[PDB]
Amino acid sequence: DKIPDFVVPGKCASVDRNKLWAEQTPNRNSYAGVWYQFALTNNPYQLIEKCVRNEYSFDGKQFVIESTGIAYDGNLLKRNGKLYPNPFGEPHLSIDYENSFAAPLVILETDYSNYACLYSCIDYNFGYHSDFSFIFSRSANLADQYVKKCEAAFKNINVDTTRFVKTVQGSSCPYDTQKTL
Amino acid sequence: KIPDFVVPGKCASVDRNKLWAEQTPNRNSYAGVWYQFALTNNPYQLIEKCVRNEYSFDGKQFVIESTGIAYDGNLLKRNGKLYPNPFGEPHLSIDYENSFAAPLVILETDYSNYACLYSCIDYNFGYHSDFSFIFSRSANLADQYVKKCEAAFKNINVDTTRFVKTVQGSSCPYDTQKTL
């Protein structure tokens, strides 16, 4: 039988969150600013298809997010999100979008000034998980050397990096306009 | 051949403002114990039978302890919260530990006997998944209340033939459950 490539047998991977959390907590401010989506794994919840541009402001408690780009229907779209500590005290954040739902998000590795590798995973009740991965860049392109750092980090938690699809980014995107939405 | 919880079209409009206005003053009456009477097929619900949800209201949100028999036969406890949507939208978020959070609307409740609950999420490919529950104040629910739930779901075009009854009653270890 055929199922989507984002439903995978087994339980979400372990991931050492406590380590990442201690490392990332004092650096929140540095995480703010603009991040471009460089690539992601097949994701049926993402409404923005191309030129995905995420603007993060940090108010000391959370990050407020404005995500913009071109939707699947060819129009411009702006979505509002928030990234805040998980409300049960687990050492991960919840990524939440307006009119949608919220999911756990772990920053598996970032150097803050070039790249960030991100990961979200959900267990189902029938022996399968679904995971969603992203490669974020501080600019419209990301150099092979940072891309490989994400590829290693995802390989290390057993994600088939063949699942990544490149996002359209670059001078063909109306970034100046997106910023005004 | 897709799962019956993956449905064509956009999530339904539900009149969330009318509901919010009705329920806001009565939150305190929503607390206490609620049993899951029936639900539409749901891949995130880890407790299979004897499902008992205990709600306490602290003023801003509800703290939940959900217990029952998991799909492996073992007893299970899950911790949840129910709080207003953090963007100011007139619906609640239902959030469970080690899981995710989804929007939840209470389509109809009389507080003392039944509740009909609804959650819906839209996909980027023109379909949606919705999840529905019927809650009862006891292990059983009279026909007259089940029918009110049926009418509320029909009204929003949920196909009520998707409901499966949950195991409750004599065979459940509620007394042990209360203790977890």
UniProtKB/Swiss-Prot annotation, chain A:
GO MF entries: pigment binding
GO terms, biological process: lipid metabolic process; response to reactive oxygen species
A GO term from the CC aspect: extracellular region
Source species, domain of life: Eukaryota
Keyword Transport found: yes
Matches recorded under Pfam families: Lipocalin
Primary subcellular site in the record, as a coarse category: secreted
Coiled coil: none
Keywords of this entry: Disulfide bond, Pigment, Secreted, Transport
Subcellular location, record wording: Secreted, Extracellular space
Keyword Secreted: yes
Disulphides: 12-121, 51-173, 117-150
Tissue-specific expression: Found in the carapace.
PANTHER family referenced in this protein's UniProt entry, alphabetically: APOLIPOPROTEIN D
Function: Binds the carotenoid astaxanthin (AXT) which provides the blue coloration to the carapace of the lobster.
Subunit structure: Oligomer; Can form dimers (beta-crustacyanin); or complexes of 16 subunits (alpha-crustacyanin). There are five types of subunits: A1, A2, A3, C1 and C2.
Family statement: Belongs to the calycin superfamily. Lipocalin family.
Name of the featured protein: Crustacyanin-C1 subunit
Organism the protein comes from: Homarus gammarus
